[PDB]
Design a protein around this ligand. Structure first.
Ligand SMILES: [Mg+2]
Ligand SMILES: [Mg+2]
Ligand SMILES: [Mg+2]
Ligand SMILES: [Mg+2]
Ligand SMILES: [Mg+2]
Ligand SMILES: [Mg+2]
Ligand SMILES: [Mg+2]
Ligand SMILES: [Mg+2]
Ligand SMILES: [Mg+2]
Ligand SMILES: [Mg+2]
Ligand SMILES: [Mg+2]
Ligand SMILES: [Mg+2]
Ligand SMILES: [Mg+2]
Ligand SMILES: [Mg+2]
Ligand SMILES: [Mg+2]
Ligand SMILES: [Mg+2]
Ligand SMILES: [Mg+2]
Ligand SMILES: [Mg+2]
Ligand SMILES: [Mg+2]
Ligand SMILES: [Mg+2]
Lengths: 90, 169, 183, 172
RNA sequence: AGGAUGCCCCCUCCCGAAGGAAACCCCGGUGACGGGGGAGUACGAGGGAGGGGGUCCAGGGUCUGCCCUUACGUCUAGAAA
RNA sequence: GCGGGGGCGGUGGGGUAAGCCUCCGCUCCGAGACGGGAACAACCGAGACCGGGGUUAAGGCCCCCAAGUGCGGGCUUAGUGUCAAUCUAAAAGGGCGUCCCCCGCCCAAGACAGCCGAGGCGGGGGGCCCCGAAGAUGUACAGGGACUAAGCCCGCCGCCGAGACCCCGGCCCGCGGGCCGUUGGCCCGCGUGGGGUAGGGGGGCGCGGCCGUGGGGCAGAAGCCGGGCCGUGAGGUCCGGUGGACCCGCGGCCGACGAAGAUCCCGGCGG
């Protein structure tokens, strides 16, 4: 079973941003969430995403729902995951 | 008689000119308006129910008569004749033909098969269109359930699908 | 030791042999993948192990009635050994027949592709006693388990349609379980 | 006086089974083979013919750049030779872009000179003399949607608007 | 009686119709994918030149693999019937 | 030739209906190759001189089988179903089975079940599925494997895929022009030129002989067996073996002039 929650770090597995990491910032419905794997950090534009097109990682930051890119960077500095975020899987 | 599926479908022009049709059958339906037919007493009735055709086809005179008896008997038994007006809105103008070897019906009916295949008269039917109003009931609003049941029983005797439409007068 | 891996469909070797663990996989989808692999690699051999743990989706009663009808109503009135059908019941033979249905018919290519396949129930002692047994999974042919979903195993089908042979095989498994766990 | 819109019409369906009236109209419109293209002036008689053959062709308003590119790639002269820019300058046209602009803007009323046209000396003719009045396109790159459905329902047939230029580029 | 000034392999060079990519960078879409550059590029039927290596090549008999394929003559709307 | 046929449309007219009878119009088969449709003359695509390259049409892309176990949402639990027709199906009627849309009423927390505290009742309709649904050689038939999506609905993206369309090379044709002493030959130009039964038109190959002309043959003619080369082809020519005296090229002319078939005739010979 796949679990997606706000603040979870995921990896996009479909699209041009495949293999790049992002952070779940908001939930649209049971099928879509909002991810901003910041464009200034990983190259993932802040957009909606289907649940089928992202795989969750094992690291999570604490943020409010729909948190801005500034808050996402602040939490990334808090968790020390900038270097993890910049990596590209496969 | 043949099954009604033999004459359900409209397959040719209407056959109604009785001055040209030889031995055209009589219309056996004895009456078409049921209940309180006078408009002065129909002024009391405010609800209109309509049994309405859903497909295009032909209804036989016997089928129309059977639906008429079942609906009229139910309405008399459970609403009383002073509380409803029921009209069979269609008349079986169309004359049905059957091609069959038979008794004294012309010398061309003694040749077998499809030779001289124009049939003799076999009955009457009403050609109906979709949305055509087959049965029209005027009633007081308290008898809505009984009127719907009578229309359902009438619809059970007809060869085409129908529906019940209720509205105010 | 058994090392599990994911079969890269574009990275299939052109030579040698590959072993596929069939547990958790759907029978028709895995058979489709195996048939395409055998057709696309003419010199590769394919072994399938754990054939009794294959899954068929649907109601158990529906699948069992389908297999019963196949093994009972399908026959011939001519010489049965010369002309009639011969319906398999054991899970390995059932899976091999399913792959034969997806291979080309009445052709040397289909015959050779079917001959280049071996199917086993469980894992044989010879395979276990190897130094390094590389097993594969095909993720596209694996059943995604969901609540309130209906499916049966080929072992359950075999038990329903042939209880005595299943009992003998299960007893053999229990008899050799100590040596199997040793290896 | 009036400058009607200049349309590109491409025959999308085939020569066998097509009904007789449509076939006759297509033959009169010069779309006698599949994937033949013509450029016409949108007078009412021509629009009546196009409405008659709506279910066998696709048509639209062609632009000057697409017309120039069509003349460069698929233009043919008498004897089936390719149309050349030096041929244009010999006849008095400076470039494919200039002649296409003149035709589309309505400075001239025809692209190809008629069979009865006579060429004088010095004057620039108002057409391209001895040019064939039709183009034979390549099949479209990436395919079409459906040659049996209208463009207005997701198919390919009928009025296409300015998307005929995109189709022509895919078909060049 | 045919070619052996052949045939085949490899390499290299030149030209080349219609057609025509890829990594990678940039813009967009949930996405399968589209677009700008890469690039009318690498390539591409075929047409020329040369280098080395080998012996037969064409053609024929039979067999195998893959692809294709419903005896003939006749009346007939309609023939494997 | 005066036997037509298929699809679609005139509720064509008739008929219970019919792969039924009889009219009207377009198209296709007959007389039309080829791709798809599981096979299949006329359903869809499409019109084929030969060879090669490319791109598309119908339709398809889990395997059989080239191309996607492609993408988003929703429905189905019946293996229902599995992308038009030929082609193998299904009705009235019943079902809150399930998903959903709308309307009337009650509940102002004193509403529906018998003090409790939050929704309840009734009606109409739509989608899928279930019952209605019973056959004869052999499996949930309608291609098979099988699939819980590889089913259905609303949308979407790319790709595969003909002889069609584009390109190259070769061939031939129609028409026009030109040159050569010509019952004819050659060259050039143009053609949204290149299917074809009956039938009409044009040219050529072969067999026996005759009028001419030029030759071969005992150092081996005709015939026969196998083989190479030429020609789209009818056919021609040459090589090796056998054989033992006639034969052939070219122009012209003439016929007892070309066989695969007639329950063909004669002979020989098989299983
Ligand atoms: Mg009729
Ligand atoms: Mg038994
Ligand atoms: Mg045996
Ligand atoms: Mg057609
Ligand atoms: Mg030689
Ligand atoms: Mg006959
Ligand atoms: Mg007959
Ligand atoms: Mg005939
Ligand atoms: Mg025949
Ligand atoms: Mg006649
Ligand atoms: Mg007809
Ligand atoms: Mg087919
Ligand atoms: Mg494939
Ligand atoms: Mg019916
Ligand atoms: Mg079924
Ligand atoms: Mg021809
Ligand atoms: Mg002579
Ligand atoms: Mg003959
Ligand atoms: Mg004899
Ligand atoms: Mg004998």
């Amino acid at each position: 079973v796949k679990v997606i929650d706000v603040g979870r770090v995921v990896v996009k597995v479909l699209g041009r941003e495949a293999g790049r990491k992002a952070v779940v910032v908001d939930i649209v419905d049971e099928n879509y969430v909002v991810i901003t794997g910041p464009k200034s950090l990983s190259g993932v534009r802040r957009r909606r995403v289907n649940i089928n097109h992202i795989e969750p990682t094992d690291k999570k930051i604490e943020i409010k729902k729909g948190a801005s890119d500034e808050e996402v960077l602040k939490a990334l500095e808090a968790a020390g995951l900038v270097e993890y975020m910049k990596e590209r899987v496969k | 008689a043949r099954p009604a599926r033999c004459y359900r479908r409209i397959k040719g022009p209407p056959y109604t000119r009785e001055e040209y049709i030889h031995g055209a059958p009589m219309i056996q339906i004895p009456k078409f308006d049921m209940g309180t037919t006078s408009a002065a007493a129909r002024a009391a009735f405010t609800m209109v129910a309509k049994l309405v055709a859903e497909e295009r086809g032909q209804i036989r005179m016997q089928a129309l008569e059977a639906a008429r008896q079942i609906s009229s008997k139910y309405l008399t038994k459970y609403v009383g004749d002073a509380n409803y007006y029921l009209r069979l809105n269609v008349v079986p103008h169309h004359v049905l033909r059957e091609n069959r070897m038979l008794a004294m019906a012309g010398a061309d009916r003694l040749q077998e098969g499809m030779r001289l295949a124009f049939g003799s008269p076999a009955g009457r039917a009403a050609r109906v269109e979709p949305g055509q109003v087959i049965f029209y009931v005027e009633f007081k609003p308290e008898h809505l359930a009984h009127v719907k049941e009578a229309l359902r029983r009438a619809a059970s005797k007809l060869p085409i699908p129908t529906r019940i439409v209720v509205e105010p007068k | 030791m058994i090392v599990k891996k994911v079969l890269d469909l574009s990275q299939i070797p052109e030579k040698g042999e590959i072993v596929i663990d069939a547990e958790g996989h759907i029978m028709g989808r895995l058979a489709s993948y195996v048939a395409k692999i055998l057709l696309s690699k003419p010199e590769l051999r394919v072994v399938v192990v754990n054939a009794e743990k294959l899954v068929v989706t649907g109601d158990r009663k529906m699948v069992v009635e389908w297999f019963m009808r196949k093994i009972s109503e399908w026959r011939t009135h001519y010489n049965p050994e010369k002309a009639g059908p011969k319906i398999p019941r054991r899970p390995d033979r059932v899976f091999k027949r399913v792959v034969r249905g997806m291979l080309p018919k009445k052709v040397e290519s289909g015959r050779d592709a079917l001959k280049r396949l071996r199917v086993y129930m469980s894992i044989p002692l010879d395979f276990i006693q190897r130094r390094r047994l590389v097993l594969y999974e095909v993720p596209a042919a694996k059943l995604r388990v969901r609540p309130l979903m209906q499916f049966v195993t080929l072992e359950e089908v075999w038990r329903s349609i042939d209880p005595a042979a299943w009992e003998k095989w299960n007893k053999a498994k229990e008899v050799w379980a100590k040596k199997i766990k040793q290896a | 006086k009036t400058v009607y819109p200049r349309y590109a019409v491409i025959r999308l369906r085939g020569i066998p089974t097509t009904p007789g009236d449509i076939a006759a109209t297509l033959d009169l419109l010069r779309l006698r083979r599949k994937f033949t293209m013509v450029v016409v002036v949108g007078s009412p008689s021509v629009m009546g013919m196009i409405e008659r053959v709506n279910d066998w062709v696709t048509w639209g308003e062609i632009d000057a750049d697409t017309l120039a590119e069509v003349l460069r790639k698929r233009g043919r002269i008498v004897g089936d030779k390719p149309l050349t820019l030096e041929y244009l300058q010999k006849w008095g046209w400076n470039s494919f872009e200039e002649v296409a602009l003149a035709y589309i803007s309505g400075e001239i009323e025809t692209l190809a000179c008629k069979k009865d046209f006579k060429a004088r000396e010095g004057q620039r003719p108002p057409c391209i003399p001895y040019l064939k009045p039709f183009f034979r396109l390549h099949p479209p790159r990436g395919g079409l949607n459906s040659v049996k459905l209208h463009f207005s329902v997701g198919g390919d047939l009928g009025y296409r608007g300015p998307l005929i230029n995109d189709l022509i580029k895919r078909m060049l």
